[PDB]
Symmetry: C2
Subunit: 212 residues, 2 copies
Amino acid sequence: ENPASKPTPVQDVQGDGRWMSLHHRFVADSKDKEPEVVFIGDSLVQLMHQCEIWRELFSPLHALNFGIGGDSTQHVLWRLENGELEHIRPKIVVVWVGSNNHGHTAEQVTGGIKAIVQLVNERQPQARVVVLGLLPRGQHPNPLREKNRRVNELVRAALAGHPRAHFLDADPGFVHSDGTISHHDMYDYLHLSRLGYTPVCRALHSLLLRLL
Amino acid sequence: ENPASKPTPVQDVQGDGRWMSLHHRFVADSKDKEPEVVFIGDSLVQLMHQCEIWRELFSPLHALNFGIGGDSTQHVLWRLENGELEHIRPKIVVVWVGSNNHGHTAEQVTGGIKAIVQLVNERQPQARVVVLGLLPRGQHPNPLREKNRRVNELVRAALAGHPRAHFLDADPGFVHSDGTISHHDMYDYLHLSRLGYTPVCRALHSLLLRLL
C-alpha cells in the first residue's frame, strides 16, 4: 500500500456527515443523469462550478462536478469505486487531485493518480481521461511548489504513452519572476479567484473540445 | 485556558506558509488603508468577498475582509492581537467564527467569541461589534446543529447587555421541515452558495446600515 492508492473514505471526525452526503448526492446524480463529462477531484474541481462560469463553458458539454474540498487521491479512488461511476457512460473523465496528499512523497501521489486513471480505464473503458497538473501554491518559493512540479513531471511521463489518457498543464504562469503568486490569481495562495480560473478553464475547455 | 480563547497562530504543517501570508497581507492592508468596517472570521467571512457580491453591498461601506478558511476563535484572536487592528479606527467590526472549533464544547466556543469581543473593545473601543450566529450545517439533523444553536443561545445572552455589541441571527430558515438543508443554499452543507449568501448578506447589510 501506497496510502495514496489505497481506496478509503474520509472518516467523519466532526459529526455532521457532510463528506458522505456529498458522495451520496453524486451517486444519485450518476443514477439519474447521463453526463458526457464527469469532473472529479478536490476543491479546485469543486469551486470551478461555483466560482468559475461553469455554465458558459462546461454546462453545454453535459457535465457533472464531483469535486470535494479536502479530497486526496485515495478519497477520489474510493468514490469512483463506491458508486460515482455507476449507471453512466461518460465520454470524458477529468481528474484533478493530489495537492492535498500531505505526508505523501511526490512518487506516492503520482502512484495515486495512476491508480485513478487505471480504475477509470477498467470501470469506464470508453472514456478519455484528462489529468490536470497540480498548480503552484503559496505566496513565495516553498517545498510544495517542488512537490507539485515533481508530481507533474512523473505524471506526464506516466501518461505519455496512453492514447486515451491526456495530461494537461493549465498553469498560465501564475508564479512571477520575483517568485510570488499574486492574491488576485489565488486569494489564499492555493484556491483560484474568478480571475485565476479563466485561463485555467479555457485551457481545459479547448482540450475538451478537441477530444469531443 | 479555554483553548478557544487562548490566542495562538495556525502552525504550518503543510510547508507553503499560506496562513501567515494571509495574516501579513491583512496587516499590510491595515497599515495602508482606512476601512470603516472590518470583517474577520473563518471561510464564511472569506468567501463572502468572492462568492457574494461584496462589491455591491459592502464595498461602498469601506470594508476590509480578513476571513481565513479554517480559522477557529483562538486563531482569530491571535490575528487581532498581532497587527490586524493596528493603524486603523474602524467604526464597526463584524465577527463570524466558531463553526470550526472542533473538540470545543459550546461553552468554550462562546468563551472564545466573548474574548474576541473583549479584545476588540480594548484595542478599538470606538467600534461597534457584530457577532453573527453560527449557521446550521450538514444535510440532516446532527450534533453540530445543536452545538451551533447552543453557541448562538449562549452568545446572544452574553451580548444582550452590551450597548455597542450586536448579535445577529442571519439564518433565513435554511433547515426545512423535513430536517434537510438543500445543496442550493449550501453546496457542501456548510459553505453557502451564491444563493445562500444573499439573504445572509442582506440581513447583515441592513444591521450595518442602521448602526452606521
